Symmetry: C2
């Protein structure tokens, strides 16, 4: 009789609206409570991603015109194709992937953070448009859209992830949501960093660094939430989900290698791009609480390219 | 023989990812094209809502403490309850309502704009948290959350709209989405408008005005897209959809009147709040391309409150 409550906590006898909408219409709904935070990590991530708000209009991409004009039509086509491919992946994640995470949230604040992620990946997709508007002809832009629609190897990658977003397994959906910012775009990000290391398109690489400042947090956060949810499963179910993660990454690496060999055909950059990709595949696995199986030889990045990748985003570009 | 295409444009033989994901897996996916924009209104709305980015940290709510301390416990409770009620609506809009619109978009840019809306109405909900952190006791905050969960009249309003978001009729979902910032907002916003006019809580009022600046664009945009899409129905199905809008608004006015009576009756503000609500219900219908059926008498607003619209 010593521990009887005079009133029962509202939180434990109500559900978030998204729970009510998709899972259980038997309880009443609670408003989000930002005054009593369940997980302090949510507040840290919310504060970082909102403080990091930026728009591509902030970057003087016009200052890349001299170095753009030092690249032949084949290079300009490769860049337009690569970036239109990255635009497709960001369109997938903004319109499907990140918003699909909201209903599977462990906390109230996580629901709002994934809304931020979906919006900011939309800004990432929009930023390629800003670059194209400054550097590319109408013909180059149209050709790259045609090439992306008609590239089966390119299309195979988002087609492999989308079913996990639309299905009812929240852990498989979460793994897909981590794999996109954690892995799938790095083969393309290699190209601007390779070029900027050789003195070309420095302002473009500034936009890539603003995109990556967001992507690394998206990857970290989805991996963090995956680890909390998978830890509640039986040992057998945890082993099954680990096998699924490695099986899906295995498939996605195969599809990425096939695509990058086609994309970089005639440039000989596929092997360098793939090593850069696998370095990031290792960090993706580490963010899900697993060990990287990749050899030093397989993940070797030129220091000049690593310097572009690791350079901190220019705060002058912050909103 | 004169009109054959040598190659069909990529746009008309591909689909956006969200179309591929939910509706048709038979075509390949196109990347969003921000260089060739189908509707210039999308670019205008995108530029306005992104340029209007704000966070509640950048308002000095602490400067309201003297004004807040001029309000008795009953007034402080009413404000905390009203704002926690608006927090619930914003939580519904952020987590379900706005994101449900993405897959039903007419244009590529509309998909990204509704992602912005979902995020920014999340910022609206967060901004009430900022106000409470500065002004309210932990007891006042917890009481208001308890009140929201146990208020059946309050709960009835989002419970009536959520089924449209999760169902497969995109125009009914669009209407249910617009009713949140376009109608249910105003019963609650009456209170800060009333208090501001009497000289209370000027810094809190700055947050309310930043929220309003976003919500008026949200309502315009959903209304704009509704009118474009309902224009592509048969005359018979256009008539059916008009009847649906009036039927659902009639239901939502019934639920709102019951809630505002329970929220305000002890303060004698319910009749003023309901007239304010009905005025904005008239504007909601005009925003969908319909006529207001409401009388001058039942939509009467005090000039100093009317001025803040
Ligand atoms: Ca090579
Ligand atoms: Ca009265």
């Amino acid at each position: 009789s010593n521990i009887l409550e005079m009133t029962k906590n509202y939180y434990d006898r109500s559900v978030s609206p998204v729970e009510y909408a998709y899972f259980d219409q038997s309880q009443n709904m609670r408003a989000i409570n930002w005054n009593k935070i369940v997980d302090e990590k949510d507040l840290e991530v919310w504060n970082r991603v909102t403080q990091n708000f930026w728009l591509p209009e902030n970057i003087p991409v016009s200052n890349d015109l001299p170095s753009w004009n030092e690249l032949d039509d084949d290079w300009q086509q490769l860049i337009t194709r690569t970036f239109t491919g990255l635009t497709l992946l960001d369109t997938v994640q903004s319109s499907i992937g990140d918003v699909a995470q909201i209903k599977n949230s462990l906390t109230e604040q996580e629901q709002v953070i994934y809304a931020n992620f979906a919006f900011m990946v939309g800004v990432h997709a929009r930023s390629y448009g800003t670059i194209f508007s400054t550097l590319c002809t109408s013909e180059q832009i149209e050709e790259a859209h045609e090439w992306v629609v008609d590239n089966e190897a390119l299309q195979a990658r988002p087609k492999a992830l989308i079913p996990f977003y639309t299905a009812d397994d929240p852990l498989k959906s979460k793994i897909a949501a981590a794999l996109m910012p954690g892995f799938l775009l790095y083969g393309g990000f290699y190209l601007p960093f390779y070029l900027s290391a050789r003195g070309k398109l420095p302002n473009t690489s500034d936009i890539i660094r603003l995109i990556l400042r967001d992507k690394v947090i998206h990857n970290f956060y989805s991996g963090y939430k995956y680890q909390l949810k998978v830890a509640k499963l039986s040992p057998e179910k945890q082993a099954e989900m680990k096998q699924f993660v490695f099986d899906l990454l295995d498939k996605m690496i195969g599809l990425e290698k096939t695509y990058l060999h086609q994309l970089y055909d005639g440039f000989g950059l596929a092997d360098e791009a793939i090593r850069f990709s696998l370095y990031n595949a290792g960090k993706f696995l580490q963010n899900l609480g697993y060990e990287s199986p990749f050899t030093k030889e397989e993940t070797r990045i030129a220091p000049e390219v690593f310097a572009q990748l690791s350079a901190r985003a220019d705060e002058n570009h912050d909103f």
